[PDB]
Design a protein around this nucleic acid. Structure first.
Ligand SMILES: [Ca+2]
Ligand SMILES: [Ca+2]
Ligand SMILES: [Ca+2]
Ligand SMILES: [Ca+2]
Ligand SMILES: [Ca+2]
Ligand SMILES: [Ca+2]
Ligand SMILES: [Ca+2]
Ligand SMILES: [Ca+2]
Ligand SMILES: [Ca+2]
Ligand SMILES: [Ca+2]
Ligand SMILES: [Ca+2]
Ligand SMILES: [Ca+2]
Ligand SMILES: [Ca+2]
Length: 94
RNA sequence: GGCCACCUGACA
RNA sequence: GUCCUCUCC
RNA sequence: GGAGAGAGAAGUCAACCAGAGAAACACACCAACCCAUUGCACUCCGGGUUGGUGGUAUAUUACCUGGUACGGGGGAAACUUCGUGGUGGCCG
């Protein structure tokens, strides 16, 4: 169990040394094929570092990305992916 | 005339 | 040039 | 946010005013390391160690150049030159 489908996928266990700009660029290049991405959020503060939220336009895209990219080697660490527990503001105010 | 502490005051 | 309270805009 | 005032930490300084005038300290940010973090967010923003950069600190408190109130000289005189916090203790 542990999550119902959502537009946004939560990714963690990311390499904490990658600068924010580069991380976002790589995440975009790797997840682009699944569908349109409305935004990608990454912060390197104490609590959000090592994590990222990739907001997809279509839920189905979130799903295919989650299934296909689970454990994918990224900057030498296998990515961990799950649906976001709640909608991202952009999706909620939409 | 030096040195540490403290006091008063200037700066802030 | 930090920080705290007060006044005013 | 901004503009005033009080309180003042840290640090520098010492009769006092003025002109010039750094440094120290605080604060902000950047870089590299180290430590911590496996964290579900949508208002930046963990800690430490080095190094660096910055400010209406465009400050003022040393240093400097002028004078002021006292005190040391010389000079009939004009005037010219030396010295300028409190207390206890330690080092010739
Ligand atoms: Ca950050
Ligand atoms: Ca948080
Ligand atoms: Ca929608
Ligand atoms: Ca203010
Ligand atoms: Ca002055
Ligand atoms: Ca000045
Ligand atoms: Ca100056
Ligand atoms: Ca934990
Ligand atoms: Ca929220
Ligand atoms: Ca430093
Ligand atoms: Ca400095
Ligand atoms: Ca300046
Ligand atoms: Ca001033």
């Amino acid at each position: 169990p542990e999550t119902r489908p959502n537009h946004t996928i939560y990714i963690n266990n990311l390499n904490e040394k990658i600068k924010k700009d580069e991380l976002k660029k790589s995440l975009h290049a790797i997840f682009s094929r699944f569908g349109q991405i409305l935004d990608i959020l990454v912060s390197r503060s104490l609590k959000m570092r090592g994590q990222a939220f990739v907001i997809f336009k279509e839920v189905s895209s979130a799903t295919n990305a989650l299934r296909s990219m689970q454990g994918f080697p990224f900057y030498d660490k296998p990515m961990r992916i799950q649906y976001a527990k709640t909608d991202s503001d952009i999706i909620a105010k939409m």
